[PDB]
PDB file of all heavy atoms in Angstrom:
ATOM      1  N   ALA D 214     134.025  56.540 170.076  1.00 51.86           N
ATOM      2  CA  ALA D 214     135.524  56.806 169.910  1.00 51.86           C
ATOM      3  C   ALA D 214     135.791  58.294 169.782  1.00 51.86           C
ATOM      4  O   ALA D 214     136.838  58.867 170.279  1.00 51.86           O
ATOM      5  CB  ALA D 214     136.052  56.053 168.732  1.00 51.86           C
ATOM      6  N   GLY D 216     133.485  60.901 170.354  1.00 48.78           N
ATOM      7  CA  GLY D 216     132.646  61.807 171.107  1.00 48.78           C
ATOM      8  C   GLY D 216     131.528  62.392 170.335  1.00 48.78           C
ATOM      9  O   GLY D 216     130.908  63.390 170.824  1.00 48.78           O
ATOM     10  N   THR D 217     131.307  61.999 169.118  1.00 48.53           N
ATOM     11  CA  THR D 217     130.223  62.537 168.290  1.00 48.53           C
ATOM     12  C   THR D 217     128.807  62.086 168.866  1.00 48.53           C
ATOM     13  O   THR D 217     128.701  60.829 169.040  1.00 48.53           O
ATOM     14  CB  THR D 217     130.331  62.113 166.922  1.00 48.53           C
ATOM     15  OG1 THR D 217     131.712  62.280 166.429  1.00 48.53           O
ATOM     16  CG2 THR D 217     129.471  62.863 165.941  1.00 48.53           C
ATOM     17  N   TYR D 223     121.630  64.684 171.269  1.00 51.61           N
ATOM     18  CA  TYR D 223     122.055  66.055 171.092  1.00 51.61           C
ATOM     19  C   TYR D 223     121.593  66.898 172.286  1.00 51.61           C
ATOM     20  O   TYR D 223     122.283  67.784 172.761  1.00 51.61           O
ATOM     21  CB  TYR D 223     121.507  66.646 169.832  1.00 51.61           C
ATOM     22  CG  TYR D 223     122.423  66.381 168.580  1.00 51.61           C
ATOM     23  CD1 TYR D 223     122.058  65.486 167.666  1.00 51.61           C
ATOM     24  CD2 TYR D 223     123.608  67.149 168.446  1.00 51.61           C
ATOM     25  CE1 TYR D 223     122.868  65.262 166.517  1.00 51.61           C
ATOM     26  CE2 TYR D 223     124.389  66.885 167.384  1.00 51.61           C
ATOM     27  CZ  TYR D 223     124.058  66.003 166.410  1.00 51.61           C
ATOM     28  OH  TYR D 223     124.852  65.809 165.328  1.00 51.61           O
ATOM     29  N   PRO D 232     125.264  72.415 174.771  1.00 49.61           N
ATOM     30  CA  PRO D 232     126.289  72.150 175.811  1.00 49.61           C
ATOM     31  C   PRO D 232     127.596  72.710 175.374  1.00 49.61           C
ATOM     32  O   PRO D 232     128.267  72.143 174.459  1.00 49.61           O
ATOM     33  CB  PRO D 232     126.296  70.604 175.868  1.00 49.61           C
ATOM     34  CG  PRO D 232     125.814  70.165 174.511  1.00 49.61           C
ATOM     35  CD  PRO D 232     125.018  71.273 173.876  1.00 49.61           C
ATOM     36  N   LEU D 233     128.037  73.811 175.980  1.00 49.39           N
ATOM     37  CA  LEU D 233     129.311  74.433 175.730  1.00 49.39           C
ATOM     38  C   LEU D 233     130.253  74.341 176.919  1.00 49.39           C
ATOM     39  O   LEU D 233     129.812  74.439 178.058  1.00 49.39           O
ATOM     40  CB  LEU D 233     129.071  75.895 175.327  1.00 49.39           C
ATOM     41  CG  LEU D 233     128.324  76.087 174.017  1.00 49.39           C
ATOM     42  CD1 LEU D 233     127.976  77.549 173.798  1.00 49.39           C
ATOM     43  CD2 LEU D 233     129.183  75.545 172.839  1.00 49.39           C
ATOM     44  N   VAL D 234     131.514  74.189 176.554  1.00 53.41           N
ATOM     45  CA  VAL D 234     132.573  74.165 177.596  1.00 53.41           C
ATOM     46  C   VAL D 234     132.904  75.634 177.961  1.00 53.41           C
ATOM     47  O   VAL D 234     133.240  76.468 177.155  1.00 53.41           O
ATOM     48  CB  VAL D 234     133.818  73.429 177.113  1.00 53.41           C
ATOM     49  CG1 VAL D 234     134.666  73.003 178.273  1.00 53.41           C
ATOM     50  CG2 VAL D 234     133.375  72.246 176.234  1.00 53.41           C
ATOM     51  N   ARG D 237     138.524  76.215 180.925  1.00 53.39           N
ATOM     52  CA  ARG D 237     139.619  75.575 180.207  1.00 53.39           C
ATOM     53  C   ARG D 237     140.083  74.321 180.817  1.00 53.39           C
ATOM     54  O   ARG D 237     140.081  73.219 180.288  1.00 53.39           O
ATOM     55  CB  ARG D 237     140.734  76.595 180.020  1.00 53.39           C
ATOM     56  CG  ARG D 237     141.914  76.115 179.103  1.00 53.39           C
ATOM     57  CD  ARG D 237     142.895  77.211 178.915  1.00 53.39           C
ATOM     58  NE  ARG D 237     144.193  76.677 178.634  1.00 53.39           N
ATOM     59  CZ  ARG D 237     145.272  77.426 178.381  1.00 53.39           C
ATOM     60  NH1 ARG D 237     145.238  78.803 178.354  1.00 53.39           N
ATOM     61  NH2 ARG D 237     146.457  76.872 178.147  1.00 53.39           N
TER      62      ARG D 237
ATOM     63  N   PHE F  97     134.223  62.116 161.145  1.00 91.16           N
ATOM     64  CA  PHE F  97     133.730  61.668 162.486  1.00 91.16           C
ATOM     65  C   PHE F  97     133.545  62.758 163.580  1.00 91.16           C
ATOM     66  O   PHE F  97     132.546  62.723 164.293  1.00 91.16           O
ATOM     67  CB  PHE F  97     134.622  60.531 162.989  1.00 91.16           C
ATOM     68  CG  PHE F  97     134.836  59.424 162.092  1.00 91.16           C
ATOM     69  CD1 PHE F  97     136.058  59.258 161.417  1.00 91.16           C
ATOM     70  CD2 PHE F  97     133.847  58.397 161.953  1.00 91.16           C
ATOM     71  CE1 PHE F  97     136.251  58.134 160.612  1.00 91.16           C
ATOM     72  CE2 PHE F  97     134.033  57.377 161.109  1.00 91.16           C
ATOM     73  CZ  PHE F  97     135.287  57.189 160.402  1.00 91.16           C
ATOM     74  N   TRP F 101     129.843  70.088 168.243  1.00 91.85           N
ATOM     75  CA  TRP F 101     128.677  70.353 169.058  1.00 91.85           C
ATOM     76  C   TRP F 101     129.025  71.025 170.368  1.00 91.85           C
ATOM     77  O   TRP F 101     128.314  71.884 170.826  1.00 91.85           O
ATOM     78  CB  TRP F 101     127.906  69.062 169.299  1.00 91.85           C
ATOM     79  CG  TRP F 101     126.590  69.183 170.081  1.00 91.85           C
ATOM     80  CD1 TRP F 101     126.273  68.464 171.181  1.00 91.85           C
ATOM     81  CD2 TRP F 101     125.474  69.998 169.770  1.00 91.85           C
ATOM     82  NE1 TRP F 101     124.990  68.792 171.597  1.00 91.85           N
ATOM     83  CE2 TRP F 101     124.506  69.740 170.742  1.00 91.85           C
ATOM     84  CE3 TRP F 101     125.109  70.883 168.775  1.00 91.85           C
ATOM     85  CZ2 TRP F 101     123.258  70.358 170.775  1.00 91.85           C
ATOM     86  CZ3 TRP F 101     123.939  71.557 168.735  1.00 91.85           C
ATOM     87  CH2 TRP F 101     122.995  71.296 169.753  1.00 91.85           C
ATOM     88  N   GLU F 112     127.269  63.032 161.187  1.00 80.96           N
ATOM     89  CA  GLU F 112     126.131  63.758 161.635  1.00 80.96           C
ATOM     90  C   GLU F 112     125.195  64.157 160.506  1.00 80.96           C
ATOM     91  O   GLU F 112     124.111  64.706 160.769  1.00 80.96           O
ATOM     92  CB  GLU F 112     126.506  64.961 162.396  1.00 80.96           C
ATOM     93  CG  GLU F 112     127.342  64.692 163.587  1.00 80.96           C
ATOM     94  CD  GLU F 112     127.996  65.925 164.222  1.00 80.96           C
ATOM     95  OE1 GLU F 112     128.996  66.409 163.650  1.00 80.96           O
ATOM     96  OE2 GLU F 112     127.472  66.374 165.210  1.00 80.96           O
ATOM     97  N   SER F 127     136.521  79.115 175.497  1.00 75.33           N
ATOM     98  CA  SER F 127     137.133  78.954 176.766  1.00 75.33           C
ATOM     99  C   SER F 127     138.522  78.417 176.814  1.00 75.33           C
ATOM    100  O   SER F 127     139.321  78.652 177.692  1.00 75.33           O
ATOM    101  CB  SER F 127     136.211  78.040 177.635  1.00 75.33           C
ATOM    102  OG  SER F 127     135.903  76.862 176.895  1.00 75.33           O
ATOM    103  N   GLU F 139     144.045  70.228 179.448  1.00 69.38           N
ATOM    104  CA  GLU F 139     142.648  70.311 179.036  1.00 69.38           C
ATOM    105  C   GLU F 139     142.062  68.969 178.765  1.00 69.38           C
ATOM    106  O   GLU F 139     140.937  68.601 179.265  1.00 69.38           O
ATOM    107  CB  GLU F 139     142.436  71.196 177.815  1.00 69.38           C
ATOM    108  CG  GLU F 139     142.796  72.682 178.012  1.00 69.38           C
ATOM    109  CD  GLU F 139     144.304  73.010 177.761  1.00 69.38           C
ATOM    110  OE1 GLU F 139     144.975  72.147 177.089  1.00 69.38           O
ATOM    111  OE2 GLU F 139     144.758  74.075 178.161  1.00 69.38           O
ATOM    112  N   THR F 145     138.984  61.245 173.265  1.00 71.88           N
ATOM    113  CA  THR F 145     137.560  61.617 173.057  1.00 71.88           C
ATOM    114  C   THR F 145     137.265  62.994 173.462  1.00 71.88           C
ATOM    115  O   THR F 145     136.579  63.761 172.746  1.00 71.88           O
ATOM    116  CB  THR F 145     136.687  60.548 173.727  1.00 71.88           C
ATOM    117  OG1 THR F 145     136.810  59.266 173.090  1.00 71.88           O
ATOM    118  CG2 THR F 145     135.204  60.982 173.653  1.00 71.88           C
ATOM    119  N   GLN F 149     136.356  66.582 171.315  1.00 74.34           N
ATOM    120  CA  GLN F 149     135.147  67.420 171.663  1.00 74.34           C
ATOM    121  C   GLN F 149     135.485  68.859 171.935  1.00 74.34           C
ATOM    122  O   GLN F 149     134.704  69.770 171.633  1.00 74.34           O
ATOM    123  CB  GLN F 149     134.364  66.771 172.787  1.00 74.34           C
ATOM    124  CG  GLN F 149     133.750  65.481 172.481  1.00 74.34           C
ATOM    125  CD  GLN F 149     133.217  64.699 173.693  1.00 74.34           C
ATOM    126  OE1 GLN F 149     133.897  64.695 174.689  1.00 74.34           O
ATOM    127  NE2 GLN F 149     132.071  64.092 173.544  1.00 74.34           N
TER     128      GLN F 149
END
Side-chain angles (χ1 to χ4, degrees):
Chain D
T217 313
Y223 273 107
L233 292 173
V234 200
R237 187 173 153 180
Chain F
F97 303 107
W101 183 234
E112 303 168 281
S127 46
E139 296 89 13
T145 292
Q149 290 167 320

